[PDB]
């Protein structure tokens, strides 16, 4: 009669159940990490241009999430204050990437920078509202 072995195997099984449960949940709440890859193409200065390029799983929500993540994670507003803008592509449905190789014009495109070169960001974001951070 051995009980501690029973709890050893039951605890391992239960922990594995909870591990897979959290794997599914984690890959579902933040999925754009797996599907979308940020493509940053710097302009003149601290200003860069962002978008996302993935498969059909990189819908407009994934593009928006990955752009926002890049904006709020690659720029430190405690050093100096940044300012960005996000531009939507209206001639595009929410799911708009072919699987293979020529994804096309991205759903969301963002311009980010700092305030030492804020004028430039105002120039690129022609009419889109500028956000500050």
């Amino acid at each position: 009669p051995k009980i501690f072995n029973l709890f050893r195997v039951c605890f391992i099984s239960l922990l594995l159940i909870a591990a897979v449960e959290y794997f599914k949940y984690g890959t579902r709440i933040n999925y754009e990490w797996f599907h979308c890859t940020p493509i940053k193409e710097p302009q003149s200065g601290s200003v860069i241009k962002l978008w996302a390029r993935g498969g059909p799983s990189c819908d407009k929500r994934g593009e928006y999430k990955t752009i926002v993540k890049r904006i709020t994670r690659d720029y430190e507003p405690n050093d100096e204050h940044l300012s960005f803008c996000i531009i939507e592509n209206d001639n595009v449905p929410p799911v708009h990437y072919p699987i293979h190789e020529d994804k096309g014009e991205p759903g969301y495109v963002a311009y980010v920078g700092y305030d030492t070169d804020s004028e430039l960001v105002q120039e690129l974001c022609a009419d889109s509202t500028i956000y500050h951070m």
Partner: protein, 315 residues
């Protein structure tokens, strides 16, 4: 009386699980509000009904249900075992000891498999799965919701096999040779059940249960006629061989061929973590390997079954 009744429990093992079950059922049923809420409902019934439809979701209450019917099946095994089989198993007699130990165990085997087989074919009958028509195991993959009977059967199998593993690792008494291979069988059965319920591959998991059960029912019938030898033994065993070949090897092999050809091209096949669509080219290897596991085990079993057939033929 505290340990006088502990002793009487030693005389009737099932009594404490029966006590727990009757207490919980009594609390749930006398409460009146036998509703979807309270607590005992989540413990003693399938939860997550989608609206007022015949479609049930998944959640932690499934774990509560599996635990509670582990307790139930622990009661049932002991109670049925002694009170029904032993009086039956010595009511005509099989004077030995290990002989009687194997009779009672295999009688319980045939009982639960005869309950769980036809119920499986029933649940497969009134659904688009009839006669292993794989084209139906993928035509709607994500399958977040199961019917009532479907979910009840699936979690009943989960609870029963989890309880078998619990009895196994908790060595009350250590049986003969077959121990460790048997542990491997229970471990892989639970991996099938859990990893197919969690990842929504539950329609494709139903036929495998059906094949395993029907094969085990015929195997148990033949083995108990062997340890209770008679003229019928040979005929039942030959029918078991035919059905084992057909069901296990042919059906599982055509299921594997299906996983290939109708996994790649029978529905959604682009991985999408946002909608929990896991049927992809990264999941095809896992599915094929983890079903080929059962296939290889079946091949090994068939080899030894062949050996047995040869030796009994030349005896």
């Amino acid at each position: 009386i505290w340990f006088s009744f502990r002793e009487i429990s030693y005389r009737h093992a099932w009594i404490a699980p029966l006590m727990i079950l009757i207490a919980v059922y009594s609390a749930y049923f006398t409460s009146g509000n036998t509703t979807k809420t309270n607590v005992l409902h989540r413990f003693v019934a399938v939860s997550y009904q989608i609206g007022d439809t015949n479609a049930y979701g998944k959640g932690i209450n499934d774990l509560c249900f599996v635990f509670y019917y582990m307790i139930f099946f622990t009661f049932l095994r002991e109670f049925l075992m002694d009170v029904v089989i032993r009086p039956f198993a010595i009511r005509l007699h099989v004077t030995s000891k290990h002989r009687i130990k194997r009779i009672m165990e295999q009688m319980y085997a045939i009982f639960y498999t005869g309950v769980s087989g036809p119920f499986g074919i029933y649940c497969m009958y009134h659904s688009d799965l009839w006669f292993f028509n794989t084209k139906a195991m993928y035509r709607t993959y994500p399958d977040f919701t199961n019917p009532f009977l479907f979910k009840v059967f699936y979690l009943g199998q989960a609870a029963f096999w989890a309880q078998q593993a619990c009895i196994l690792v908790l060595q009350l008494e250590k049986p003969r040779k077959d121990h460790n291979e048997l542990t491997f069988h229970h471990i892989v059965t639970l991996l099938l059940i859990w990893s197919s319920y969690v990842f929504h591959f539950t329609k494709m998991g139903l036929p495998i249960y059906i094949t395993m059960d029907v094969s085990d029912f015929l195997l148990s019938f033949s083995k108990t006629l062997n340890y209770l030898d008679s003229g019928l033994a040979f005929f039942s065993f030959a029918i078991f061989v035919v059905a084992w070949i057909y069901l296990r090897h042919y059906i599982n092999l055509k299921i594997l061929w299906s996983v290939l050809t109708q996994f790649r091209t029978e529905g959604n096949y682009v991985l999408n973590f946002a909608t929990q669509q896991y049927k992809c080219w990264i999941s095809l290897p896992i599915v094929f390997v983890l079903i080929g596991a059962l296939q290889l085990v079946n091949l090994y079993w068939l080899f030894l079954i062949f050996r047995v057939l040869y030796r009994i033929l030349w005896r």
